[PDB]
Short mmCIF file of C-alpha atoms in Angstrom, two decimals:
data_model
loop_
_atom_site.label_atom_id
_atom_site.label_comp_id
_atom_site.label_asym_id
_atom_site.label_seq_id
_atom_site.Cartn_x
_atom_site.Cartn_y
_atom_site.Cartn_z
CA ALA A 1 34.64 -130.41 -133.12
CA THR A 2 37.12 -129.66 -136.02
CA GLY A 3 39.61 -129.91 -133.46
CA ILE A 4 41.91 -127.18 -135.37
CA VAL A 5 43.38 -124.99 -133.14
CA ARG A 6 44.88 -121.65 -133.84
CA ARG A 7 46.81 -118.90 -131.63
CA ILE A 8 45.25 -115.30 -131.28
CA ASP A 9 48.03 -112.89 -132.35
CA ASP A 10 49.07 -109.71 -131.08
CA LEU A 11 46.14 -107.39 -132.19
CA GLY A 12 43.62 -110.04 -131.04
CA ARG A 13 43.36 -111.59 -134.38
CA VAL A 14 42.85 -115.41 -134.77
CA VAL A 15 42.59 -116.84 -138.47
CA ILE A 16 39.64 -118.83 -139.40
CA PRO A 17 40.96 -121.85 -141.12
CA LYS A 18 40.35 -121.80 -144.95
CA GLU A 19 38.13 -125.18 -144.82
CA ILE A 20 35.93 -123.07 -142.63
CA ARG A 21 35.70 -120.20 -144.67
CA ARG A 22 34.75 -122.11 -147.71
CA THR A 23 31.91 -124.60 -145.99
CA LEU A 24 30.57 -121.27 -144.53
CA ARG A 25 31.61 -118.94 -147.71
CA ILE A 26 33.01 -116.35 -145.87
CA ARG A 27 35.16 -114.11 -148.25
CA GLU A 28 37.74 -111.49 -147.58
CA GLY A 29 35.84 -108.69 -146.14
CA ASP A 30 32.88 -110.25 -145.01
CA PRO A 31 31.24 -108.97 -141.70
CA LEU A 32 30.99 -111.26 -138.76
CA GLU A 33 28.96 -110.85 -135.81
CA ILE A 34 30.48 -111.74 -132.49
CA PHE A 35 28.75 -113.36 -129.19
CA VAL A 36 29.92 -114.52 -126.03
CA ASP A 37 27.99 -117.65 -124.95
CA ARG A 38 26.97 -118.72 -121.30
CA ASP A 39 29.53 -121.34 -121.63
CA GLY A 40 31.93 -118.57 -122.25
CA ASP A 41 32.41 -119.59 -125.83
CA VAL A 42 33.22 -116.94 -128.53
CA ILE A 43 30.52 -117.24 -131.38
CA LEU A 44 30.97 -116.12 -134.98
CA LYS A 45 28.31 -115.99 -137.48
CA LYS A 46 28.00 -114.17 -141.09
CA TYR A 47 26.65 -110.83 -140.74
CA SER A 48 23.88 -110.27 -143.35
CA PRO A 49 23.01 -106.50 -143.11
CA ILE A 50 20.60 -107.07 -146.14
CA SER A 51 18.74 -110.05 -144.59
CA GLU A 52 17.89 -108.96 -141.41
CA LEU A 53 16.68 -106.07 -143.31
CA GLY A 54 13.76 -108.65 -143.22
CA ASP A 55 11.12 -106.75 -144.55
CA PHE A 56 12.57 -103.64 -146.36
CA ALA A 57 13.49 -106.23 -148.80
CA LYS A 58 9.82 -107.75 -148.99
CA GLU A 59 7.96 -104.70 -148.88
CA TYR A 60 10.33 -103.10 -151.58
CA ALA A 61 9.95 -106.08 -153.84
CA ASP A 62 6.31 -106.03 -153.37
CA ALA A 63 6.19 -102.51 -154.49
CA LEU A 64 8.45 -102.90 -157.39
CA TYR A 65 6.13 -105.41 -158.67
CA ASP A 66 2.99 -103.64 -158.00
CA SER A 67 4.42 -100.74 -159.94
CA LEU A 68 6.24 -102.77 -162.69
CA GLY A 69 4.71 -105.77 -162.72
CA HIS A 70 8.16 -107.97 -163.45
CA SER A 71 9.58 -110.31 -160.88
CA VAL A 72 11.79 -109.19 -158.32
CA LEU A 73 14.55 -110.69 -156.36
CA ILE A 74 16.48 -109.15 -153.68
CA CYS A 75 19.50 -111.33 -152.31
CA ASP A 76 22.06 -110.74 -149.62
CA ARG A 77 25.78 -112.24 -150.32
CA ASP A 78 24.36 -115.63 -150.22
CA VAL A 79 20.57 -116.19 -150.83
CA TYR A 80 17.27 -114.57 -152.01
CA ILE A 81 15.64 -112.92 -148.99
CA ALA A 82 12.66 -111.51 -150.94
CA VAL A 83 10.63 -112.61 -153.70
CA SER A 84 7.69 -111.06 -155.71
CA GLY A 85 6.07 -111.62 -159.10
CA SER A 86 7.53 -115.10 -159.22
CA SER A 87 7.00 -117.80 -156.60
CA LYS A 88 8.53 -117.99 -153.26
CA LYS A 89 8.97 -121.66 -153.36
CA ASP A 90 11.14 -121.27 -156.38
CA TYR A 91 13.77 -118.50 -155.00
CA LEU A 92 13.24 -117.88 -151.29
CA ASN A 93 16.43 -118.82 -149.39
CA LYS A 94 18.00 -120.32 -152.45
CA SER A 95 21.54 -119.89 -153.33
CA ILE A 96 22.27 -116.97 -155.64
CA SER A 97 24.02 -117.94 -159.08
CA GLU A 98 27.66 -117.15 -160.02
CA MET A 99 26.30 -114.21 -162.19
CA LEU A 100 24.85 -112.63 -159.68
CA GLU A 101 28.22 -113.03 -157.19
CA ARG A 102 30.38 -111.43 -160.16
CA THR A 103 27.68 -108.74 -160.99
CA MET A 104 27.78 -107.83 -157.17
CA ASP A 105 31.62 -107.78 -157.21
CA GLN A 106 31.46 -105.66 -160.35
CA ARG A 107 29.69 -103.43 -157.99
CA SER A 108 27.89 -101.81 -161.35
CA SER A 109 24.18 -102.21 -162.25
CA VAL A 110 23.40 -104.25 -165.36
CA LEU A 111 20.90 -104.46 -168.07
CA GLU A 112 20.53 -107.51 -170.21
CA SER A 113 17.53 -106.73 -172.49
CA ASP A 114 18.57 -109.75 -174.84
CA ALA A 115 20.52 -113.08 -174.42
CA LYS A 116 18.58 -115.93 -172.64
CA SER A 117 19.46 -118.98 -170.53
CA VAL A 118 20.57 -117.21 -167.41
CA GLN A 119 21.05 -118.55 -163.95
CA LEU A 120 19.46 -117.03 -160.89
CA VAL A 121 19.52 -119.80 -158.39
CA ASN A 122 22.72 -121.65 -158.49
CA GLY A 123 22.55 -124.37 -160.87
CA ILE A 124 19.23 -123.63 -162.42
CA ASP A 125 19.26 -122.19 -166.04
CA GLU A 126 16.16 -120.15 -166.76
CA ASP A 127 14.21 -118.96 -169.68
CA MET A 128 14.58 -115.32 -169.69
CA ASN A 129 13.87 -112.51 -172.05
CA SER A 130 15.43 -110.04 -170.06
CA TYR A 131 16.65 -108.85 -166.44
CA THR A 132 18.46 -105.97 -164.80
CA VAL A 133 20.59 -106.20 -161.75
CA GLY A 134 21.55 -103.73 -159.11
CA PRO A 135 24.07 -104.41 -156.56
CA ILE A 136 23.39 -103.06 -153.37
CA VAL A 137 26.76 -101.26 -152.17
CA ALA A 138 26.98 -100.05 -148.53
CA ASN A 139 30.31 -98.39 -147.60
CA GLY A 140 32.00 -99.69 -150.90
CA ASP A 141 31.04 -103.24 -150.04
CA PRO A 142 28.57 -105.10 -152.19
CA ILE A 143 25.95 -106.64 -149.36
CA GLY A 144 23.35 -107.73 -151.74
CA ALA A 145 21.30 -107.27 -155.11
CA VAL A 146 17.97 -106.28 -156.44
CA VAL A 147 17.03 -108.34 -159.73
CA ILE A 148 13.98 -107.49 -161.66
CA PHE A 149 13.28 -109.80 -164.48
CA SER A 150 10.88 -110.94 -167.18
CA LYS A 151 10.37 -114.17 -168.95
CA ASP A 152 8.64 -112.33 -171.90
CA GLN A 153 9.04 -108.65 -171.60
CA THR A 154 12.23 -106.37 -172.40
CA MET A 155 13.98 -104.47 -169.60
CA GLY A 156 14.71 -100.69 -170.30
CA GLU A 157 15.82 -97.47 -168.80
CA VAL A 158 12.44 -97.77 -166.52
CA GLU A 159 13.39 -101.14 -164.76
CA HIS A 160 17.21 -100.20 -164.95
CA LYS A 161 16.56 -97.02 -163.16
CA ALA A 162 14.33 -98.74 -160.97
CA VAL A 163 17.18 -101.14 -159.60
CA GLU A 164 19.44 -98.48 -159.26
CA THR A 165 16.99 -96.42 -157.00
CA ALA A 166 16.06 -99.64 -155.13
CA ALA A 167 19.92 -100.65 -154.78
CA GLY A 168 20.78 -97.19 -153.74
CA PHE A 169 17.73 -96.77 -151.24
CA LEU A 170 18.63 -99.96 -149.54
CA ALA A 171 22.18 -99.53 -149.51
CA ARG A 172 21.60 -96.20 -147.53
CA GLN A 173 19.70 -98.13 -144.87
CA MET A 174 22.73 -100.26 -143.97
CA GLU A 175 25.14 -97.34 -143.10
CA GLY B 1 26.32 -106.97 -131.64
CA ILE B 2 29.83 -106.40 -132.43
CA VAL B 3 30.69 -107.01 -136.28
CA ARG B 4 34.21 -107.33 -137.49
CA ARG B 5 35.15 -108.12 -141.20
CA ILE B 6 37.55 -111.14 -141.86
CA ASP B 7 40.73 -109.97 -143.77
CA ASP B 8 42.86 -111.38 -146.45
CA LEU B 9 44.25 -114.36 -144.75
CA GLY B 10 41.06 -115.34 -142.93
CA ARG B 11 41.94 -113.11 -139.86
CA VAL B 12 39.01 -112.01 -137.79
CA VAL B 13 39.85 -109.60 -134.79
CA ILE B 14 38.29 -110.73 -131.54
CA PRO B 15 37.06 -107.43 -129.78
CA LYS B 16 39.32 -106.39 -126.85
CA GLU B 17 36.16 -106.57 -124.71
CA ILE B 18 35.75 -110.03 -125.30
CA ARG B 19 39.48 -110.89 -124.96
CA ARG B 20 39.29 -109.52 -121.37
CA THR B 21 35.95 -111.05 -120.17
CA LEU B 22 37.63 -114.27 -121.34
CA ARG B 23 41.05 -113.60 -120.37
CA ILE B 24 42.43 -114.47 -123.96
CA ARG B 25 46.11 -113.25 -124.20
CA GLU B 26 48.10 -112.96 -127.39
CA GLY B 27 49.36 -116.36 -128.29
CA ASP B 28 46.48 -118.36 -126.40
CA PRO B 29 45.45 -121.31 -128.55
CA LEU B 30 41.60 -121.25 -129.41
CA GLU B 31 39.87 -124.49 -130.64
CA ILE B 32 37.43 -123.86 -133.55
CA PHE B 33 34.21 -125.61 -134.29
CA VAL B 34 31.34 -125.44 -137.13
CA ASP B 35 27.90 -125.73 -135.45
CA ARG B 36 24.33 -126.75 -136.96
CA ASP B 37 23.59 -123.11 -137.43
CA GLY B 38 26.76 -122.70 -139.22
CA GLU B 39 28.24 -120.83 -136.34
CA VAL B 40 32.09 -120.80 -135.86
CA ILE B 41 32.80 -121.52 -132.14
CA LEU B 42 36.13 -120.64 -130.29
CA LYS B 43 37.19 -121.83 -126.96
CA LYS B 44 40.18 -121.73 -124.81
CA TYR B 45 41.97 -124.94 -125.74
CA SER B 46 42.94 -127.02 -122.77
CA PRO B 47 40.29 -128.14 -123.28
CA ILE B 48 37.25 -128.88 -121.01
CA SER B 49 36.95 -129.30 -117.32
CA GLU B 50 39.46 -130.64 -114.50
CA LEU B 51 39.53 -131.23 -110.91
CA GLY B 52 39.92 -127.89 -109.12
CA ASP B 53 37.16 -125.93 -110.72
CA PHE B 54 35.11 -126.70 -108.03
CA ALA B 55 37.31 -127.97 -105.41
CA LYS B 56 37.75 -124.82 -103.70
CA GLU B 57 34.10 -124.08 -103.54
CA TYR B 58 33.12 -127.82 -102.68
CA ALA B 59 35.56 -127.93 -99.87
CA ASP B 60 34.35 -124.50 -98.69
CA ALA B 61 30.79 -125.91 -98.56
CA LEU B 62 31.73 -129.00 -96.85
CA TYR B 63 33.34 -126.99 -94.15
CA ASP B 64 30.73 -124.39 -93.48
CA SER B 65 28.23 -127.62 -93.42
CA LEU B 66 30.11 -129.93 -91.09
CA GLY B 67 33.02 -128.02 -89.56
CA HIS B 68 35.46 -130.55 -90.05
CA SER B 69 38.93 -130.05 -92.06
CA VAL B 70 38.40 -130.96 -95.88
CA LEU B 71 41.01 -131.90 -98.25
CA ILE B 72 40.78 -132.49 -101.78
CA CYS B 73 43.57 -134.04 -104.01
CA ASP B 74 44.21 -134.94 -107.70
CA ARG B 75 46.54 -138.03 -108.05
CA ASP B 76 49.63 -135.85 -106.93
CA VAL B 77 48.88 -132.96 -104.60
CA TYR B 78 46.05 -131.58 -102.42
CA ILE B 79 44.55 -128.98 -104.42
CA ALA B 80 41.78 -127.19 -101.98
CA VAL B 81 41.90 -127.03 -98.18
CA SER B 82 39.17 -125.75 -95.82
CA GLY B 83 38.76 -125.92 -91.84
CA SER B 84 42.68 -126.69 -91.75
CA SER B 85 45.36 -124.26 -92.76
CA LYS B 86 46.47 -123.74 -96.62
CA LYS B 87 50.01 -123.59 -95.88
CA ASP B 88 49.89 -127.15 -94.29
CA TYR B 89 48.26 -129.01 -96.99
CA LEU B 90 47.84 -126.89 -100.36
CA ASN B 91 49.88 -128.25 -103.16
CA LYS B 92 51.61 -130.99 -100.88
CA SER B 93 52.30 -134.66 -101.83
CA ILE B 94 49.58 -137.05 -100.71
CA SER B 95 50.51 -139.85 -98.57
CA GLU B 96 50.67 -143.56 -99.34
CA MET B 97 47.52 -144.35 -97.53
CA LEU B 98 45.74 -141.56 -99.86
CA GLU B 99 47.24 -143.41 -103.15
CA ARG B 100 45.93 -147.02 -102.03
CA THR B 101 42.83 -145.72 -100.87
CA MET B 102 42.40 -144.18 -104.28
CA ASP B 103 43.42 -147.35 -106.16
CA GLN B 104 41.18 -149.14 -103.90
CA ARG B 105 38.35 -147.12 -105.26
CA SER B 106 36.36 -147.85 -102.46
CA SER B 107 35.68 -144.99 -99.73
CA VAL B 108 36.59 -145.21 -96.19
CA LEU B 109 35.67 -144.32 -92.67
CA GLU B 110 38.23 -144.46 -89.86
CA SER B 111 36.14 -143.08 -86.84
CA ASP B 112 38.90 -144.86 -84.37
CA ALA B 113 42.25 -143.43 -85.95
CA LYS B 114 45.12 -142.31 -83.62
CA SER B 115 47.20 -141.44 -86.43
CA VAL B 116 47.22 -140.96 -90.23
CA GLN B 117 49.41 -139.85 -92.71
CA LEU B 118 47.54 -137.29 -95.31
CA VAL B 119 51.04 -135.78 -96.71
CA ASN B 120 53.60 -137.97 -97.61
CA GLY B 121 55.74 -138.60 -94.95
CA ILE B 122 53.87 -136.78 -91.97
CA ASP B 123 52.44 -138.78 -89.35
CA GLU B 124 49.48 -136.85 -87.90
CA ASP B 125 47.29 -137.15 -84.68
CA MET B 126 44.11 -137.91 -85.94
CA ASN B 127 40.66 -138.86 -84.25
CA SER B 128 38.99 -139.82 -87.39
CA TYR B 129 38.87 -139.11 -90.97
CA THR B 130 36.71 -140.46 -94.11
CA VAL B 131 37.74 -140.55 -97.58
CA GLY B 132 35.77 -140.75 -100.66
CA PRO B 133 37.84 -141.78 -103.87
CA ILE B 134 36.85 -139.58 -106.89
CA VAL B 135 36.57 -142.46 -109.72
CA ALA B 136 35.87 -140.94 -113.09
CA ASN B 137 35.13 -143.59 -115.94
CA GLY B 138 36.38 -146.18 -113.27
CA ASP B 139 39.59 -144.29 -113.21
CA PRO B 140 40.74 -142.92 -109.47
CA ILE B 141 41.63 -139.33 -110.24
CA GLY B 142 41.66 -137.60 -106.98
CA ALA B 143 40.00 -138.07 -103.35
CA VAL B 144 37.95 -136.05 -101.11
CA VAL B 145 39.18 -136.27 -97.19
CA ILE B 146 37.00 -135.04 -94.33
CA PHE B 147 39.14 -135.10 -90.95
CA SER B 148 38.89 -134.32 -87.34
CA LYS B 149 41.64 -134.48 -84.72
CA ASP B 150 39.18 -134.45 -82.03
CA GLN B 151 35.70 -135.45 -83.15
CA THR B 152 34.33 -138.67 -84.50
CA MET B 153 33.01 -139.18 -87.97
CA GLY B 154 30.11 -140.86 -88.65
CA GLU B 155 27.41 -141.63 -91.58
CA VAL B 156 26.91 -137.74 -91.93
CA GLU B 157 30.49 -137.22 -93.12
CA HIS B 158 30.86 -140.71 -94.97
CA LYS B 159 27.98 -139.73 -96.99
CA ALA B 160 29.24 -136.38 -97.50
CA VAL B 161 32.66 -137.40 -99.09
CA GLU B 162 30.48 -139.82 -101.14
CA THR B 163 28.26 -137.25 -102.58
CA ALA B 164 31.25 -134.89 -103.01
CA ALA B 165 33.24 -137.76 -104.72
CA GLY B 166 30.38 -138.68 -106.87
CA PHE B 167 29.28 -135.12 -108.04
CA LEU B 168 33.21 -134.24 -108.71
CA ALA B 169 33.49 -137.41 -110.63
CA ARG B 170 30.47 -136.56 -112.82
CA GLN B 171 32.16 -133.03 -113.65
CA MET B 172 35.17 -135.24 -115.22
CA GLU B 173 33.01 -137.11 -117.63
#
């Protein structure tokens, strides 16, 4: 019980208090799934396309790894939902870094082949040779990202194109 | 499986389907909760349960079962009537006898009445009646009344008001 009361407006819009939207990191545009509970409740929960995608991500990340041999992360808007190459305990279900959020917002794919000391997981700085990120934008809306990285090899067009292909394929799925 | 986006201003639209199956009208106040799983919960704010969610159905059952007249009151009026006529009792002010019986907190059985006021100021012919005060959290919040203008009440009906008062009480806790 937050015991916050709001009225529903003409148009059936209720405002979710900013407190809530922060403790749940719901940003403008975020999709929420609605349920009615037995008790008659209305239920709102973040809707993560990319995450209930469940195993596209896993299978995709696995293939990228078999093919390129680099570490591969796929995230929704909040956590990493698939990990290959690197260790799952390190990344799976962990909060993405701020760099990831902005890259996703920036909507454009990136390739850093130099400049080490990056954060993939919120608050953890990591040794890194190079990485590339392909934001997964479905319906103009960033809903996740694909990350390929290497702690001792340089990324090039090969891996850069690969995240673009992955992001594009995955995006299409969510449409 | 209906998805809606939250807008600038943190407003999500509750689909019209929902707003109908829950009869939420423009302006209605909704209480917000956050849950374990990080779900937001909205519920029509009053909140929670109140005597009368049940009274009708309960009084009806008591009548189908025992065939006597059944009244249920809150602290002021009769909120459910079965057996007898609704026009006679529904929304009418309880008698002083009812108020004191409720205060007295204890259930009563008058199997040898000749009269009784159920409604404030109206004396009524009565064979017998039994009253079960509805005490929730040690506090009388209503009563269940079974009465008969020509039959005697016994353990059957006496137990019945006790069961009804106890069940209804629990609801309000």
